Amino acid sequence: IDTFSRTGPLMEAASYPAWTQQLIQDCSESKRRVVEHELYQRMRDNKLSAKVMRQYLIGGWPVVEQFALYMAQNLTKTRFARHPGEDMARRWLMRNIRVELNHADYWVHWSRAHGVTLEDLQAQQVPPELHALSHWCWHTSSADSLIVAIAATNYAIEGATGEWSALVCSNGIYAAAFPEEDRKRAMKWLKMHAQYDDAHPWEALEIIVTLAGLNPTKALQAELRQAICKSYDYMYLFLERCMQQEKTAVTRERLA
């Protein structure tokens, strides 16, 4: 039968098969260097330059705007009662597309609090290192299997995003730096995503495990690992380029 059914708590690695625990371990350093990135420690402390903050918001926009569209593309690959994991995916995607209803609007508001206009967002004037994530997300959503594309976007990206957004909000400095009358609206996107204990990525993982079963091939495991690490690695590429610009911007004003 090879059929997976969770007994343990949703949000614990030990509730899943050994291969899934292995997958988490194999991707852990790729994840870590994103969720603990220096850029986020600086953002938390309100230290980032206007230039970099602007690039971050513009660069992140396409992935945020199109996030429910990746989910939609994945829904399009599912069929009713073809496999238990596939029914689980269908229902989950139908429920969670709705969750994103206002999230692009919140990003627009976050952006405007830093002087980034809707026009600025739409112009997409950022380095290519910043656009790579969006192209990967569409490629996997378009061309890959459901299980792989869900791993790349709902597990990897949303999981890491819960953690970086929690880090940004973790000491109150960033939020308190906004004028009181601007703060609620500016912070909304971050507040809605800020959680270490968010079920979303664990629900995605559960779906992936159900799709794959107890004994997936090594080849499928490799496909998942590579897709998940690709997502983290493109986030890392984005952040590294941002930090290069940060050093230049800060250094210029230090010397000026």
Ligand X SMILES: CCCCCCCCC/C=C/C(=O)O
Task: Kindly tell me which of 24 and 97 has the beta carbon lying closer to its own copies.
Answer: 97
63 is in the binding site of which of its own copies, Fe ion, ligand X, none (Cβ under 5 to 8 A by kind)? ligand X
Task: Kindly tell me which of 89 and 237 has the beta carbon lying closer to ligand X.
Answer: 237
Residue bearing tokens 């970099």: 52
Q: How far apart are the first and last CA of the chain?
A: 69
Output DSSP code: residue 153.
Answer: I
- Site for its own copies contains 122 (CB under 8 A): yes
CB of residue 154 to its own copies, shortest distance in Å? 15
CB of residue 93 to Fe ion, shortest distance in Å? 14
100 labeled part of a ligand binding site: yes
Say how many residues touch Fe ion, by CB under 5 A. Answer: 2
In single-letter form, the type of residue at position 216 comes to P
Among the residue ranges 41-49, 54-62, 99-107, 226-234, the one whose residues contact Fe ion (CB under 5 A): 99-107
133 is in the binding site of which of its own copies, ligand X, Fe ion, none (Cβ under 5 to 8 A by kind)? ligand X
Q: How many residues would you count in the chain?
A: 256
Residue bearing tokens 């593309």: 73
Q: In 10 A of CB 18, how many CB atoms?
A: 9
Task: Kindly tell me which of 158 and 206 has the beta carbon lying closer to ligand X.
Answer: 158
Q: Which residue is nearest to ligand X (CB)?
A: 60
- Interaction with its own copies in 47-86: which residues (CB under 8 A)? 65, 68-69, 72-73, 75-76, 78-81
CB of residue 113 to its own copies, shortest distance in Å? 18
Out of 33, 77, 103, 131, the residue judged to bind Fe ion by CB under 5 A: 103
- Interaction with ligand X in 145-204: which residues (CB under 6 A)? 157-158, 161, 193
- Interaction with ligand X in 104-133: which residues (CB under 6 A)? 133
Judged by phi (left if over 0) then psi (alpha if -120 to 50, else beta), residue 88 lies in alpha
Q: Do residues 80 and 87 make contact, with C-beta atoms less than 8 angstroms apart?
A: yes
- Site for ligand X contains 65 (CB under 6 A): no
Reduced to 3 DSSP states, what percent helix, strand and coil does the chain have, rounded to the nearest 5?
75, 0, 25
DSSP string, 156-209: IIHHHHHHHHHHHHTTSHHHHTS-HHHHHHHHHHHHHH--SS-HHHHHHHHHHH
Give the footprint of Fe ion on this chain (CB under 5 A). Answer: 100, 103
